[PDB]
Amino acid sequence: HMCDAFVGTWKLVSSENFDDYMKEVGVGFATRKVAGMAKPNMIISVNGDVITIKSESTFKNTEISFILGQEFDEVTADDRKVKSTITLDGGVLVHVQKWDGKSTTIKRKREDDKLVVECVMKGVTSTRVYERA
Ligand SMILES: Cc1nc(-c2ccccc2)nc(Sc2ccc(F)cc2)c1C(=O)O
């Protein structure tokens, strides 16, 4: 029952400062423009200890499956090859991606009927809000 409140199908309803977050990450112009337009569907499911997060969009579809605390390989929407670890900290999913000596942290939290995603790359935060689809 660890992620019960995250499970489901979610749709992006708002975004703030995502272009700047992507600039800090190192995303190029064209990918920032097209990725920034996307209105992804996030589908979160749990089967035993394995959590799956799928993102479906017009630009790219992504999928990760993982066990909490156990590092894995991820290919991001912008085609970075990263080493990721996802943990639960006080009811917040905390996702750290490492690549090329860089790091970004993505936090996912339930707040009211929303799933709030906070993405941080050095000093820059983007906040992305999802509602149930
Ligand atoms: C945390 C995050 N990072 C990035 C992301 C995207 C590009 C470069 C770096 C990071 N995208 C998304 S959602 C998304 C999925 C597919 C897509 F084609 C566009 C957006 C999210 C999200 O969870 O809201």
| Domain 4-130: assigned CATH number | 2.40.128.20
How many A from CA of 128 to the centre of ligand 1? Answer: 9
- Ligand 1 site, CB within 6 A: 22, 25, 27, 35, 38, 40, 55, 57, 59-60, 62, 76-78, 106, 117, 119, 128
- Residue 129, marked binder: yes
Residues 54 and 61: beta-carbon distance below 8 Å: yes
- Residue 130, marked binder: yes
Can you give the residue ranges of every domain in the chain?
Answer: 4-130
Instruction: Please state, in angstroms and as integers, the Cα–Cα distance from residue 102 to each residue in 24, 34, 66, 106, 125, following that order.
Output: 10, 23, 21, 14, 15
How many A from CA of 49 to the centre of ligand 1? Answer: 24
The technique by which this structure was obtained is X-ray
Measured distance CA(20)–CA(125) in Å, rounded: 8
